[PDB]
């Protein structure tokens, strides 16, 4: 679950890449991949990016990235709930180990 | 699932269904109802099916009044046996429904919700049905 908690921060970069692709998806739609992207945010002007996309649709790849991001934030809710439940279960099971170990 | 938990006799004659409804002819609890047009025995399984079919589509709304009750039992002789040698064991319960009788009563919803719920109930029943409403002369 902590692996998915790191996949949460990984998914945000994918969402940003999808937004960059969306603000530039008006040319090279046919077989679109490794297309240089001009920085849309910040004054950094960071090196042109080269996103690679599958052959679905130039917009549905960015839309798929944005969907992965929504699933990621729902995961941020649910996996934290599951971690809380799992530590409660580990505390109860360690207590049950203690009560079984010293029992007649 | 409706059945009496105690009966005076477990085996009864099947009776006759001549004439109109003796009572329960006018809608007087809910706003809308089903009026029977033909006479047949209505099994409590059919009553349960109609009640679930109304209640599911009326997930928000008023309660359902079931005006009929399966008080009369029917006996079913076991299969592959000869005729006679005693009356068979009772199997289920039916309600004797005459034409003109109100079957189920609905109040507290809209018009089209009630009409569609009564249509879904009527498609489970073995009798011809019609839509009736309360009349206020009065």
């Amino acid at each position: 679950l902590e692996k998915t908690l790191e996949y949460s921060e990984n998914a945000k970069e994918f969402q940003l890449y999808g937004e960059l692709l969306t603000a530039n998806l008006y040319m090279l739609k046919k077989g679109d991949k490794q297309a240089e992207v001009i920085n849309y945010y910040d004054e950094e002007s960071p090196t042109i990016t080269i996103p690679l996309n599958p052959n679905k649709t130039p917009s549905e790849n960015a839309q798929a990235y944005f969907t992965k991001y929504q699933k990621a934030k729902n995961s941020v809710a649910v996996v934290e709930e599951q971690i809380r439940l799992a530590q409660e279960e580990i505390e109860y099971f360690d207590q049950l180990i203690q009560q079984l170990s010293s029992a007649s | 699932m409706l059945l009496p938990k105690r009966v005076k006799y477990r085996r009864e004659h099947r009776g006759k269904m001549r004439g109109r409804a003796k009572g329960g002819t006018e809608v007087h609890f809910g706003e809308f109802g089903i009026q029977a047009l033909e006479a047949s025995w209505i099994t409590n399984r059919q009553i349960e099916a109609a009640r679930i079919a109304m209640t599911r589509y009326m997930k928000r709304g008023g309660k359902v009044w079931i005006k009929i009750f399966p008080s009369k039992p029917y006996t079913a002789k076991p299969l592959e046996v000869r005729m006679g040698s005693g009356k068979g064991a009772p199997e289920g319960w039916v309600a004797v429904v005459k034409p003109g009788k109100v079957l189920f009563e609905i109040s507290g919803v809209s018009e089209e919700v009630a009409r569609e719920a009564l249509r879904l109930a009527s498609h489970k029943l073995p009798i011809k049905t019609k839509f009736v409403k309360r009349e206020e002369i009065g």
Partner: protein, 133 residues
């Protein structure tokens, strides 16, 4: 022609003005300075600017008034509206700045009289969740 509401203080980068002028066939960065020159005195607000298109790749932009929504945010102070207007009355705006907001919309709106305009911006104020008082 493609019309759009361009923010004054964030017209430099590749968002909104980027892909709109990119499909027209002109360099965005050569006109971002021209946008920021005329949007300096109304900075901090989102200004709709008409983007006319010509065959000889020359572009002249006809700016418009600020919207009645943004001007009511200036008059009230809150940036984001309520979740349910006419259910959570978050702000109240006096009628004098309402008259000023209606008087700012003379050269674009086709209203014959200012009373019609203040009756319009009363209706826009009701969509804001802001009490007209």
């Amino acid at each position: 022609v493609v019309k759009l509401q361009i923010p004054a203080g964030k017209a430099n980068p590749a968002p909104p003005v980027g892909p709109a002028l990119g499909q027209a066939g002109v360099n965005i960065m050569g006109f971002c300075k021209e946008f920021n020159a005329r949007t300096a005195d109304q900075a901090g607000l989102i200004i709709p600017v008409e983007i006319s298109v010509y065959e000889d790749r020359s572009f002249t932009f006809i700016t418009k008034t600020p919207p009645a929504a943004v001007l009511l945010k200036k008059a009230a102070g809150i940036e984001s509206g309520s979740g349910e207007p006419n259910r959570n009355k978050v702000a109240t705006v006096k009628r004098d700045k309402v008259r000023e907001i209606a008087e700012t919309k003379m050269p674009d709106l086709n209203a014959a009289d200012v009373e019609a305009a203040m009756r319009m911006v009363e209706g826009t104020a009701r969509s804001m969740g802001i009490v007209i008082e």
